[PDB]
Design a protein that fits this description.
- It is classed as structural protein/dna.
- The entry lists the keywords histone fold, DNA binding, nucleus, nucleosome, chromatin formation, DNA methylation.
- The assembly is decameric.
- Nucleosome containing unmethylated Sat2R DNA.
- The complex is a heterooctamer, with two copies of chain A, two copies of chain C, two copies of chain E and two copies of chain G.
- By secondary structure, chain A is mainly alpha-helical.
- Chain A has one domain: Histone, subunit A, CATH 1.10.20.10.
- In chain A, α2 packs across α3 and α3 runs antiparallel to α4.
- The longest helix of chain A is centred in the middle third of the chain and has 28 residues.
- Chain A contains four helices and two strands.
- Chain C is mostly helical.
- Chain E has a single domain, classed as Histone, subunit A (Orthogonal Bundle), CATH 1.10.20.10.
- Chain E is built from five helices and three strands; from the N terminus they run ααβαβααβ.
- In chain E, α2 packs across α3 and α3 packs across α4.
- The longest helix of chain E is centred in the middle third of the chain and has 26 residues.
- The radius of gyration of chain E is 19 Å and the shape is elongated.
- Chain G has a single domain, classed as Orthogonal Bundle (Histone, subunit A).
- Chain G contains four helices and two strands, in the order ααβαβα.
- The longest helix of chain G is centred in the middle third of the chain and has 28 residues.
- The termini of chain G are far apart.
- The chains are: A mainly alpha (about 90), C mainly alpha (about 80), E mainly alpha (about 100), G mainly alpha (about 100).
- Chains in contact: A-C, A-D, A-F, B-C, B-D, B-E, C-F, C-G, D-E, D-H, E-F, E-H, F-G, G-H.
- Chains E and H meet through α4 of E and α1 and α3 of H.
- Chain H binds a DNA duplex (146 and 146 nucleotides) through α1, α2 and β1.
Amino acid sequence: SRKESYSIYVYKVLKQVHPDTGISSKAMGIMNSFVNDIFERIAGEASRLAHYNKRSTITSREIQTAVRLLLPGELAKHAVSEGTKAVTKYTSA
Amino acid sequence: RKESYSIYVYKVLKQVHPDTGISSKAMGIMNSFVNDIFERIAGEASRLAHYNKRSTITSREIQTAVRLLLPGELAKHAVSEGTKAVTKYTS
Amino acid sequence: RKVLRDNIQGITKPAIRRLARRGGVKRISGLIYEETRGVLKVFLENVIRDAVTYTEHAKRKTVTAMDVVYALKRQGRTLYGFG
Amino acid sequence: NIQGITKPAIRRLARRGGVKRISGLIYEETRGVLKVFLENVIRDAVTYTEHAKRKTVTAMDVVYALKRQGRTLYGFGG
Amino acid sequence: KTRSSRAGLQFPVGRVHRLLRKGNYSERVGAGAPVYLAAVLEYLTAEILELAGNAARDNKKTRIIPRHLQLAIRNDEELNKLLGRVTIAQGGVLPNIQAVLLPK
Amino acid sequence: RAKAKTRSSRAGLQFPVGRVHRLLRKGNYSERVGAGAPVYLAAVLEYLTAEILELAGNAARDNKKTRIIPRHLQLAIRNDEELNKLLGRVTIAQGGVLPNIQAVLLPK
Amino acid sequence: PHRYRPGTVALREIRRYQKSTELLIRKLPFQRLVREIAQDFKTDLRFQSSAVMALQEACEAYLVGLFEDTNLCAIHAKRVTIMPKDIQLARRIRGERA
Amino acid sequence: PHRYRPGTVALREIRRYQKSTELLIRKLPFQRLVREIAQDFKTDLRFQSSAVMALQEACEAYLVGLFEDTNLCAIHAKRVTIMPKDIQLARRIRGER
DNA sequence: ATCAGATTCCATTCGAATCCATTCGAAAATGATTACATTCGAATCCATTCGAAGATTCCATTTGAGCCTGTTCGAAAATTCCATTTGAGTCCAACCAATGATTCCATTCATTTCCATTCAATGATTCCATTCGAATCCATTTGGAT
DNA sequence: ATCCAAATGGATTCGAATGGAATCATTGAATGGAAATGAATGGAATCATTGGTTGGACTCAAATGGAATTTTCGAACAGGCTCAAATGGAATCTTCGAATGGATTCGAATGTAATCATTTTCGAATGGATTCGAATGGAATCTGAT
C-alpha cells in the first residue's frame, strides 16, 4: 500500500533556502498539490502547443513556450533561466 | 485538405428544419461550437479514465463527461440520444 | 438510519457572522443570514453533485476527498491539501 | 494610437451595453482597460506566432490566445 | 457500410474515432465512445440549429445569421449556461434596458 | 558495467527528472517526449517550489515559529503579487485570509 | 456600568478571525447538511472524513471571498452594511447569475 | 425648435445598436492600435486580416460585457451614470484586478 | 389630455450584388480482414474504514432588552455632461505590384522508442525527540465616559 | 485632557502530538544495443500582406444652452449592535460491527496493427438566388403649448 509524493524534493529544496526551518505535514500536502497542479498546467499547455503545430513530440522548446504562457512576468523569466540552465548543463555530459 | 463539420451541420440543419440554408460565417460559428464541445467532452473523458487508472475511453466515460459538462435537461437528452445511437450501432 | 431534515439551519447566525468577519464585514443586515444559506446551499449542491458523479463513475459508494477535489477543480475552484 | 479610440466609438460601445449616462473620466478609463486587454491577448497571441517560427500572426493564434485567457471566440476556425 | 449510418447519424462517427486517437486523450478508444460522442454532438448541433432557424424567420430572414445564433443561445437558459464563457462573433447582445432607466 | 547516476544530478537538480519524464509519458500529453523536456520542467517545478518555500519561511520566522504551516504558505502567496496571480483561483487548506480592513469602516 | 459602542466588537473580531485559519462553521451540523444534500441526490452513500473536511474548507473559502466582494458592493453604494442586494450584485458580476 | 430632452434618444440609440451586430469601433484606428501594441512585444510582425477582425470582435465584446456589469454597478449605488469607480468595482469583482 | 407640429421608425415594393448550393474530377480517409497484444469484466480473500451509538463536559447558541447610529426620506445647490449645429479630416475602399514568407517535398543524420536486466532512489513502517497547542499571568494598551 | 476594566499582547511553562531519521523491502530509474521516427536542410512555387495613391463621405471634434441628475445637507424613522442569562448539543473519547474497498490472480472480448481497395469530402468554379440599401407614405411617438 504505497503511493508517490514530491515530499523529499520539496524537503531538500526547503533545506537549501531555510536550513533552520521545518515543514508541517499538512503544509507539505499543500506543497504536493502545488507541484502537481503546476506540472499539469505546464504539460497541458505544452501538449496544446505541439498539437496546434502538428508535431508529435513535446520538447524543451514546448515546455518553455508553456512557461512563458502560464507564468506571470518576472516569475516566468526566472523560470526560463533555471530551466535552460538545467537543460544545457544536462546536454553536456 | 483540410477538415470541417460543415456538411454535417447542413444535413442536420435541414433534417430538423427544412426551412433554411446556412451562411458561411454562421457555418463558422457552428464549426467552432462543434469543435469546442468535442474538446470539452473528450478532455473530461480522458481525465475520468486517468483518475480511475483505465487506459481506454469507453462510452461510459463519454457519458459521465456529458453529465458533468452539460447542464440539466440538455444533459439528459444528450445521454439519451447517446445511448440510443450506441444501441442501434450494436445492431 | 434517521431522517435528515432542515440542516441548512445548522449554519447558524453566529457562524455566518464569523464568516462575515474573516471576510471583512463590519455590519450585517438581518435579511443576509437566510440569503447566505440560500447561496451556500446552491454552492454545496453544485459541488456535491459533481463529486457524487465522480464517485458513481468510479463505481464506488463512498465519496473520496479526491472526488471532492476533482469536483471543485471542475467548478474552477482548485483546492490544495487533500490530494 | 490609443486616441484613435474615439469618444463616439466608446459611447456606442456603452450603448450596446445599455448605459444611460457617461462620466467624462470614463473614455480615458475605458481606453485604459481596453489597452490592458488588448496587450494581454496579443502577448499570448504573439507568443504563439513565435513558437510556430512564423512572423505572421494567424487568426488561429488570436483564437488560442483568447481561449487561454478564458474569452472563447467562435467563428474564426476554432 | 458506414458506422454513422449503422448508428443512424449524420455526424461522422469515423472521423470522431480518428480524432479520439490523434488527440492524445488515451492510448485506446473504445468502439462505442465515438458513436456516443458523435451522437451528443449531433443533438447539440440540432437543438442549436432549431432554435436558430426559428430565431431566423421570427425576423423573417430565410437564413440563420450569427445574430440568430446569438438570440437562440442567449434566450435558451441551459444553452446560455453551456456557452456563457463563449463569445459569438457577429452576435450582438440581447435588447435589454434596466427598468430604473426607462422613461417615467 | 558502468555505474549510473541520475539525470537529476547531470542537470544539478534536486527534483526527480526521471519521474517527471515518466509522468510526461503516462499522461497522454504527446506520443513522444524529447529528452530535454523533463529536465526543463523539473527545473521549473524545483524553481517555483523554491521561491514559495523561501517566502513562506520568511512569514514563518516573522510569526516566531520554526516550522512552515499552511497559514504561512497563504501569507507568502497572497502578499507576493505574481504568486498571487499564479494561484489566483487556488484555495489553500487551512490558509486563512490576509488581514485587510477597508478605509471607510475605520473610526472617524 | 460598561461596555463598548456600536462598531467596536465588529472591528475587534474582524481582526480576530482574519488572524486565524479555523473553520468558522461548526463541524457536525455541516456534516449533516452534506449528508442530506448528498443523499437526496443519491442514496446509500458513504463519506471519507477527509472528503467532508475538503467540502467544508472549500465552502468556507467560497463564502468568505463572497463576503469580501459583498462588502465592497455595500461600500460602493456608500453603506457600511452588507445587504442581500449586495450579495446578488456580487454573484451577478461573478458570472454565477444573469 | 421642438427638440429632444436629456437622455431619451440616448435610450433610442441604445435599442438600435443593441439590435445590430455592427462593429462599433472604427476599424483602421483599431488596426493601428493593434499593430503598435504588438510591435512593443516583437517587431517585424504582420497580421492576417482575419486576425485583426478577430481581435476587434473580442475587444468590442469584452467592452460590451464590461459596460453591462458597470451599469449594474452604477444602478446599485442609486446613481444612473457610469463612473471610473464603477468600472473598477466591476473589474475587481470579476477578478481582473 | 389633446392640440397639433417635426422628426423617426416603420414597413411595403424596388433594383443590384454579393453569395449558397449544386455539380465535378482527386486527394485523403474510412471500412474490412485476418492476426495480435492486452484491458479489465469475474471473482474470492484480506482490512481499512466508516458508521452508529453512548456519555459527559462546557462551549456557544438562543432569546430578548435598550439604545446608538447609519439608512432613507426630503429638499436645495451645484455641475457635470445631453443635445445639435458647423466645419474640418481622417476613415472607407479599389484595385493594384511586388516581394517576403509561408509551405510541400525529399533526402540523411540525430533523436526518441523498445525491451529486458540489475542498481540505487524511495517510499511505510516503528522508533524517539522536539515544536507547540493549551494555561496563567503581568503589562500595554485600548475605549468610553467626567 | 484624565480615570476605570477589561482586553492585548506576549513573556514564560509543561504535557504530547507531530515531527524528522534509521532500517528493510521493492518499485522504478537507468543502461545499452537495435528499431522506428522526426526535424531540419536546402529547395522551390503560390500566396496573402504590405504599400502607396487617390477620390467622397460620412464621421468626428468643439462650442454653446439649460434641463436634469448628482452631493450635499439635515431630519427622522429604525434596524442591527451590544449585553447577559439559559442549556443545548457539539466536541470529544473509545469502543466495535461488517459493508465495501482494493491487492492478486486468471480469462474471454475488446481494441490495435497493419494493409489494401473502395468510398468520401474537399475543392473550386458556375447558375439561381436572398438582402443590402433607397424610396417614400403613415403611423408613431415625441413635443412646446390651448
